RNA sequence: GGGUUUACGACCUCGAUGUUGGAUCAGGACACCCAAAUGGUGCAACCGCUAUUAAAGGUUCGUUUGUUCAACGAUUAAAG
């Protein structure tokens, strides 16, 4: 932060970071604005890791 | 005193308490100086003079509170309770201010 | 209001009252902690 | 944002020499170690160790009920464990 | 036709309902109730080492300084009670805090009866040796909802004119 | 008895408290060395809702029940005497007991219909449509159950549910 | 508006959290009071932190008291240790004698407390000696011409292995 | 004005080692092969077992008869070992595992064709009977404020009582039966079969007094 | 509306029918005969 | 606690109590889909999600299927 205006850094996953400029200006009153670059991997929530091997196995049909 | 210092003091100016502490029915005076010369009631307002006046051969103890309302609220309390005068100077307050 | 069969205060504001030959807890604070005694 | 750098500096044998931390201003000067005849007996005749029981008092004097007030709270907040509001 | 043992509470015989409810319990109801009745007699409550220490103290208070000032314990924020210490430790006078359920039965057993209209709110008892009134007015009069009740001056009970003669004198 | 006044002379207001005479208790009691009131002058399981000469003596001008630590009643008896003093007042004894309203006296409503030994409060009891049958009856409950403890000259106890 | 409380660095007085948001709510800027607090302890050791109250008046404006530094600090400085023990009373972090604790005690008695408060050296002087049996620091009597460094050695490779220890259980909580 | 009362210390407990409660299988070790009649006389009656403390201070009575299973196990085991502390409080078991084998059919099934097959395995408890018992450097507040939730997830009714509560609740039941004021008891006209009565009563009666029926248990029925 | 399941004096179901101060008297007065009874039988 | 599904029992009928779906007419319960009066919301608004009270009145037309159901098309304040 600098003054009146807070700066706040963070290690957010690319797949819960869609549609977030909605909800940033949203709960910020259109004043608060947001900047996102590729960082680095790590494994992977086992929610997620279930949702995307569930999603893999509905694509190639069999279970 | 809480009753008090939810009720937004600042529209008073002076009120003063004078009693004699060596008599029999200064109880409910004492506790009704206490009670507005509480730390909350100081804070609440800086404006105002709370002043206690000590005697020994008044014998009517009262109070007297002058807001800038131009207004006078003089109470002389021999016998009242001092949960009936609260009541009574916080309805006043509200009600004028 | 949520109908309970046993009424517990959720916080120190929450109050007690019997009306219309009910019990109830009602709040002032929090209003999700009104409760009505079945 | 951290602390202050200097520590230690010669830990073997500065800190027996004397302290350096009590010195606060920008302009070094370290104080004496102002030996044993300078402080007065009142600070070796202090428990510098663990403190007192209460079943090792005297129940006539007032750090006595000073601690039976503490272990009061204890109790009481042990007791209050399950608030539910 | 169902088991001996049930969940559904198994409803008896109207022969063996006619002897539970025969059978049922009946306590004993004395002729005149006790609650309001003429009360046992005193169980005397024994003292104990804090009423003992609270005793021991006021009497030393009481017996040893001269100066015995008694002043309403306004209710004021800490920090502002800490700086009216600190002036009273500057003029090296103290002040003391007691229960009235320990004070009360000591000063009228002692000579100082003619206390009793002081002691019956919130107390704050002004101890000091070599009694000077001057500097203690003097930094009371700062503070104006604070009011000098009275107090004795050497075996001398004064009121707030009292005080304020003996400091002018 | 005391009384506060207001007197209002240009925007000077003057809250006063006036002391006035108080009768006192008689002075032969018939057992005087009862701790409680009702249980020393031998009223205990001897009153009702009916004896408003002895349920008005401890009650405020407005309906208003007395505070125990004031009277002195056992609190069997307070609770009892309360119950006593509803009942009262719902089925219409002690009529001088009421906030005078000049401004509400005048719309005229329904008139009160005559009612005795009412437990509840006739604005929250709800009608039994069900009324039940003669193994599962819904008694209508009639007069308060700590009135349980009264003579019974006839012998018979008192049916509080019918 | 009333009174915050807050552990400022010395010359350390960056205009952000945790101190920016809340006087900005409070109504004062925030440049002048770190310009204010630098001019103020700029004859401080930069880098030492210490307690101070802001007074924020109704009108937006703000009164600066400053005290002496922490307690933890001048424990932290008199032992020659830069964190404390994790698990207090297990192990020990340095070793501080009486002598030191007076001085520190001594240093200390010009505060607002101690001032508020007409208390002899004594009671510093314990309360110094329990803040130090929090943070973990031990109290000889007179111990200090060569076993402090002797048990400094021991503490040092104490806190090598502590930080392999950490480290392998990170590692494995990783795996995990 | 209030005094300073002392506040109890205690000493001379000692926690033992592992004061969680253990696991508890839902089947045993040997699996009863053989099937078993669904006695329910191991429920009926007062409980002659695990009447008394052992070395707890608190326990939960249970003032009915019933079955334990290992949902209730399981229940109980989480619930005290996740409101219990480790480091001031131990408990133990009471109860033993699921033994007693219940037997099933499946849906759709007519009368006859012989019994069913072994579905789970429960516990029998009769009314009386402790099922955990506690104790420690704690106080009974906290214990039976923790433990009230238990003993209403039981199957039977059940209380939090300590040995102050339980010896309290044995010598009021004492002084009720000892100073009933109506000279007709269950007890007395059950074995004096008085009015013919044990036609309509049991040979179990003359034993439970009136206080016992079925698996139920009224405390206050003298 | 409120209906009895099966028979009214049978079933795991029954009606609910209490007893009677009368009865209760009744009992009372036998239990009192019957005490009689095994008295004039002890000696 | 209710007695809507399947089962269990075999108590009334085998000198007959005619058995699914539809057409016509519907009676009733409320555990309310709509319409009405409110409470709580992680209720900003439009839409919502729950809970309370209320049963005087409504609760569509079609393709397939004997279908009750089910899928689908177009609507409705709703298609209990
Ligand atoms: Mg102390
Ligand atoms: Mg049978
Ligand atoms: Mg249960
Ligand atoms: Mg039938
Ligand atoms: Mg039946
Ligand atoms: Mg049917
Ligand atoms: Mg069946
Ligand atoms: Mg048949
Ligand atoms: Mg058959
Ligand atoms: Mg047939
Ligand atoms: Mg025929
Ligand atoms: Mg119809
Ligand atoms: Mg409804
Ligand atoms: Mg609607
Ligand atoms: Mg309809
Ligand atoms: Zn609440
Ligand atoms: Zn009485």
């Known amino acids: 932060g600098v003054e009146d205006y807070f700066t706040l850094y963070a290690d957010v996953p690319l797949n819960d970071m869609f549609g977030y400029s909605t909800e940033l200006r949203s709960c910020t009153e259109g004043k608060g604005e ?10 992977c929530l086992p929610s997620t890791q279930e949702d995307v091997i569930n999603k893999y196995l509905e694509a190639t049909g069999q279970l | 005193a809480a009753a008090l210092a939810r009720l937004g003091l600042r529209a008073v100016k002076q009120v003063r308490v004078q009693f004699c502490p060596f008599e029999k029915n200064v109880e409910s005076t004492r506790t009704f100086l206490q009670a507005v010369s509480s730390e909350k009631v100081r804070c609440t307002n800086l404006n105002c003079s709370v002043i206690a006046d000590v005697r020994h051969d008044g014998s009517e103890p009262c109070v007297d509170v002058l807001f800038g309302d131009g207004h006078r609220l003089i109470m002389r309390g021999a016998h009242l309770t001092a949960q009936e005068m609260l009541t009574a100077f916080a309805s006043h307050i509200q009600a004028r201010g | 209001f949520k109908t309970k069969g046993v009424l517990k205060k959720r916080c120190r504001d929450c109050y007690l009252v019997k009306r219309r030959g009910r019990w109830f807890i009602y709040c002032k604070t929090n209003p999700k902690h009104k409760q009505r005694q079945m | 944002e951290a602390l202050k750098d200097p520590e230690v500096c010669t830990d073997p044998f500065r800190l027996t020499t004397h302290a350096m931390g009590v010195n606060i201003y920008k302009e070094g000067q370290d104080v004496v170690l102002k030996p044993d005849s300078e402080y007065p007996e009142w600070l070796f005749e202090m428990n510098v160790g663990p403190p007192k029981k209460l079943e090792e008092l005297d129940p006539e004097t007032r750090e006595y009920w000073r601690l039976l007030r503490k272990h009061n709270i204890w109790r009481h907040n042990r007791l209050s464990k399950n608030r539910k509001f | 036709g169902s088991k001996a043992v049930t969940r559904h509470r198994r409803v008896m015989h109207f022969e063996r309902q006619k002897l ?35 005793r021991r103290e006021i009497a030393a208070v009481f017996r040893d300084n001269r ?32 229960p009235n359920q320990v004070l009360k039965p000591f000063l009228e057993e002692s000579k100082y009866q003619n206390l009793l209209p002081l002691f019956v ?20 009069k700062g503070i104006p909802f604070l009011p000098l009740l009275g107090g004795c001056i050497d075996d001398t009970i004064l009121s707030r004119q009292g005080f304020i003669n003996y400091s002018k004198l | 008895f005391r009384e506060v006044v207001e007197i209002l002379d240009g925007k000077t ?55 125990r630590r004031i009277t002195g009643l056992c609190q069997e008896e307070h609770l009892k005497i309360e119950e006593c003093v509803k009942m009262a007042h719902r089925a219409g004894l002690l009529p001088n007991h009421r906030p005078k309203l000049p401004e509400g006296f005048v719309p005229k409503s329904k008139p009160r219909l005559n009612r005795y030994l009412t437990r509840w409060s006739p604005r929250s009891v709800k009608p039994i449509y069900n009324k039940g049958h003669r193994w599962n009856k819904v008694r209508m409950p009639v007069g308060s159950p700590l009135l349980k403890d009264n003579v019974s000259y006839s012998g018979r106890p008192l049916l509080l549910y019918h | 508006s009333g009174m915050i409380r807050a552990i400022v660095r010395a010359g350390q007085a960056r205009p952000g959290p945790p101190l920016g948001p809340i006087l900005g709510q409070r109504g004062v800027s925030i440049n002048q009071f770190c310009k204010e607090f630098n001019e103020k302890t700029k004859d401080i050791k930069e880098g030492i932190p210490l307690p ?13 008291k400053i005290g002496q530094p922490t307690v933890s600090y001048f424990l932290k400085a008199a032992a020659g240790i830069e964190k404390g023990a994790r698990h207090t009373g297990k192990e020990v972090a340095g070793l501080v004698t009486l002598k030191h604790v007076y001085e520190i005690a001594r240093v200390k008695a010009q505060d607002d407390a101690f001032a508020l408060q007409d208390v002899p050296l ?55 | 004005f209030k005094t300073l009362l002392p506040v109890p210390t205690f000493e001379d407990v000692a926690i033992p080692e592992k004061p969680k409660l253990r696991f508890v299988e839902r089947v045993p070790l040997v699996p009863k092969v053989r099937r078993e009649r669904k006695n329910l006389s191991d429920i009926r009656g007062p409980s002659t077992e695990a009447t008394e403390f052992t070395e707890g201070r608190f326990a939960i009575l249970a003032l009915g008869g019933g079955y334990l299973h290992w949902g209730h196990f399981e229940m109980m085991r989480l619930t005290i070992n996740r409101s219990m502390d480790p480091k001031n409080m131990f408990a133990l078991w009471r109860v033993p595992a699921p033994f007693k084998p219940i037997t099933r059919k499946g849906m759709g099934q007519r009368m006859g064709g012989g019994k ?11 009314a009386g009977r402790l099922i955990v018992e506690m104790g420690g450097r704690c106080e009974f507040k906290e214990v039976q404020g923790f433990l009230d939730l238990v003993a209403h997830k039981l199957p039977f009714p059940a209380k939090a009582v300590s040995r102050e509560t339980l010896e309290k609740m044995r010598k009021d039941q004492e002084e009720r039966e000892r100073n009933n004021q109506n000279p007709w008891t269950f007890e007395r006209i059950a074995t004096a079969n008085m009015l013919g009565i044990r036609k309509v009563l049991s040979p179990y009666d003359l034993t439970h007094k009136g206080r016992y029926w079925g698996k139920f248990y009224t405390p206050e029925r003298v | 509306r409120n209906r009895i399941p099966g028979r009214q004096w049978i079933g795991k179901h029954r009606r609910p029918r209490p007893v009677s101060a009368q009865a209760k008297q009744n009992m009372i007065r036998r239990l009192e005969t019957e005490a009689e009874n095994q008295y004039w039988l002890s000696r």
């Open chain 7, 52 to 64: 101070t109250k802001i007074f924020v008046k109704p009108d937006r404006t703000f009164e600066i």
């Open chain 5, 67 to 98: 100066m015995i000032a008694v002043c309403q314990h306004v209710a004021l924020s800490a920090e502002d009670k800490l700086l009216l210490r600190h002036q009273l430790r500057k003029h090296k006078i103290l002040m003391k805090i007691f």
């Open chain 1, 34 to 43: 947001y900047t996102m670059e590729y960082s680095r991997y790590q494994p």
């Open chain 7, 122 to 176: 004594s009671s510093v002087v314990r309360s110094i000696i329990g803040s130090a049996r929090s943070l973990g620091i031990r109290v000889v009597k007179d111990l200090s011409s060569e076993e402090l460094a002797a048990f400094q050695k021991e503490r040092a490779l104490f806190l090598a292995a502590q930080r392999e220890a950490d480290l392998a259980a990170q590692a494995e909580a990783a795996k995990k």
């Open chain 5, 20 to 54: 539970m409810a025969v059978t049922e319990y009946i306590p004993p109801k004395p002729t005149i109730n006790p609650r309001c009745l003429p009360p046992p007699p005193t169980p005397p409550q024994e003292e104990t080492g804090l009423v003992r220490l609270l």
């Open chain 5, 121 to 140: 709110g919130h107390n704050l008892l002004l101890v000091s040796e070599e009694p000077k009134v001057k500097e203690m007015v003097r930094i009371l």
């Open chain 8, 116 to 126: 069913g097959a072994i579905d789970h395995y429960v516990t029998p408890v009769k």
């Open chain 6, 13 to 67: 207001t003057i809250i006063e408290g006036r002391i006035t005479e108080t009768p006192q208790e008689s002075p032969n009691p018939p057992n005087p060395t009862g701790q409680c009131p009702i249980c020393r002058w031998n009223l205990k399981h001897k009153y009702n809702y009916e004896d408003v000469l002895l349920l008005s003596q401890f009650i405020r001008p407005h309906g208003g029940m007395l505070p």
